[PDB]
């Protein structure tokens, strides 16, 4: 989700 | 690019917006007091990623170093937002608008008190120094930032924002001598502020495993700090 | 009440001798390495006490003052000093001038070998920055002293070195904004000092309990911290 | 000993 966030 | 003039506009446009969450009806204890904080982080932390992706160059470093970056300085962004946030105020913890926290209240959870007086300590001395907003909004970058295509990329950036802090100061007027000693001492505030994220990291540890309150979602992913570890 | 350029040169005289160890005649073992490590400390932290008290202003401070500042930057201190003397040897940390140990060394000890990687990293850093000899005398007694007339004369040492630190940037010459920047990019490093210092405070903690190296007299006195826990 | 080398 961090990571979803960051690449969204 | 970009002129130092240039990126700390670009810093106040990526300012996140004031976080909306009120005190529980009911008086706080040690678990609702925990639960309103877990709340409001977790939503500020949506808030700082939208931030951290607004700063130039961010989202051009590694994916894997935007996350090592946002996981090792969060807690100390939030407290540094929270000092700002509470400058005027002594006393007392602006941690949301409508969410104003005595330095008493601290009492109600056991340990948070200690760290509490750290933080308004920190803060009394934002306030003696007066922290500008301009230069707040760099600092809290800073923290970030200072926290090989992408170390190189890392590094022009945290330059950047360097260089900004140092133009907003000498905007001020001041002698050259006056101007290096107010960057020194904000600089030097700022491993105070470290410190008090680290006990703060600590504390909230503990609660979640003494199970006094819940951590999910993306506030557990960031506090477990995987990616970081390794 | 004495100038900048005064305080320089009494942080010069007060500069503690080297310390000699050498490397045992027996290769290294987790054990002997972590001995010769604690062996090394200890007279360390006996001449860092008497530096700490030669800085103008220092023994003035109330005596619980001395204690926890001592307490709870020594390692940090430490850490400097290794950084410096290991500034112009890439690769290498200097210890002690017969004691020199290579990165890949850091395999003897479980769970070293990352702090010293930790330390060679800001030391690399110190060193593309050029770090001066009076420079770093100034960082050191920053170190110290950054961690009501007891607080008052702090602040006031504080600003002193701080002062002396500009005072030094200020005789390379180069331009005020040059001066900004590099003051910036030293006080930036420090947190990184202070974070291998914490790695390094946490894994000698380990290394005691896991009974691994016996810590006595002093070394254990500083790394227990009593009078700073409170 | 901290506390005696600082009084000493
Ligand atoms: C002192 C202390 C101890 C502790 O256990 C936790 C926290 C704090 C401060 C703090 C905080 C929250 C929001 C802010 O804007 C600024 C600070 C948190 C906290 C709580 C839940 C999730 C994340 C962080
Ligand atoms: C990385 C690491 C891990 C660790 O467990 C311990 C230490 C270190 C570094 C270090 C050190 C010693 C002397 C120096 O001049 C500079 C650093 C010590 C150490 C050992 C014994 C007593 C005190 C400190």
Same mark, same amino acid.
């Given at each position: 989700?961090?990571?979803?966030?960051?690449?969204? | 690019?970009?002129?130092?003039?240039?990126?700390?506009?670009?810093?106040?446009?990526?300012?996140?917006?004031?976080?909306?969450?009120?005190?529980?009806?009911?008086?706080?204890?040690?678990?609702?007091?925990?639960?309103?904080?877990?709340?409001?982080?977790?939503?500020?932390?949506?808030?700082?990623?939208?931030?951290?992706?607004?700063?130039?160059?961010?989202?051009?470093?590694?994916?894997?170093?935007?996350?090592?970056?946002?996981?090792?300085?969060?807690?100390?962004?939030?407290?540094?937002?929270?000092?700002?946030?509470?400058?005027?105020?002594?006393?007392?913890?602006?941690?949301?608008?409508?969410?104003?926290?005595?330095?008493?209240?601290?009492?109600?959870?056991?340990?948070?008190?200690?760290?509490?007086?750290?933080?308004?300590?920190?803060?009394?001395?934002?306030?003696?120094?007066?922290?500008?907003?301009?230069?707040?909004?760099? %600092?809290? =970058?800073?923290?970030?930032?200072? &926290?090989?295509?992408? #170390?190189?990329? !890392? @590094?022009? $950036? /945290?330059?950047?924002?360097?260089?900004?802090?140092?133009? %907003?100061? =000498?905007?001020?007027?001041?002698? &050259?001598?006056?101007? #290096?000693?107010? !960057? @020194?001492? $904000? /600089?030097?505030?700022?491993?105070?502020?470290?410190?008090?994220?680290?006990?703060?990291?600590?504390?909230?540890?503990?609660?979640?495993?003494?199970?006094?309150?819940?951590?999910?979602?993306?506030?557990?992913?960031?506090?477990?700090?995987?990616?970081?570890?390794?």
């Amino acid at each position: 989700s961090l990571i979803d966030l960051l690449a969204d | 690019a970009l002129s130092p003039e240039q990126l700390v506009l670009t810093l106040l446009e990526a300012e996140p917006p004031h976080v909306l969450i009120s005190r529980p009806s009911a008086p706080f204890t040690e678990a609702s007091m925990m639960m309103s904080l877990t709340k409001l982080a977790d939503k500020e932390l949506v808030h700082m990623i939208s931030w951290a992706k607004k700063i130039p160059g961010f989202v051009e470093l590694s994916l894997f170093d935007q996350v090592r970056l946002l996981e090792s300085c969060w807690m100390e962004v939030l407290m540094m937002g929270l000092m700002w946030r509470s400058i005027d105020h002594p006393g007392k913890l602006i941690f949301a608008p409508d969410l104003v926290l005595d330095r008493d209240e601290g009492k109600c959870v056991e340990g948070i008190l200690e760290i509490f007086d750290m933080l308004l300590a920190t803060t009394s001395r934002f306030r003696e120094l007066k922290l500008q907003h301009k230069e707040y909004l760099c %600092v809290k =970058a800073m923290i970030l930032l200072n &926290s090989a295509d992408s #170390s190189r990329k !890392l @590094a022009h $950036l /945290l330059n950047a924002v360097t260089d900004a802090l140092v133009w %907003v100061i =000498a905007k001020s007027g001041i002698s &050259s001598q006056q101007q #290096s000693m107010r !960057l @020194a001492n $904000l /600089l030097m505030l700022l491993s105070h502020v470290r410190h008090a994220s680290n006990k703060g990291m600590e504390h909230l540890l503990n609660m979640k495993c003494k199970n006094v309150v819940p951590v999910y979602d993306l506030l557990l992913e960031m506090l477990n700090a995987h990616v970081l570890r390794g």
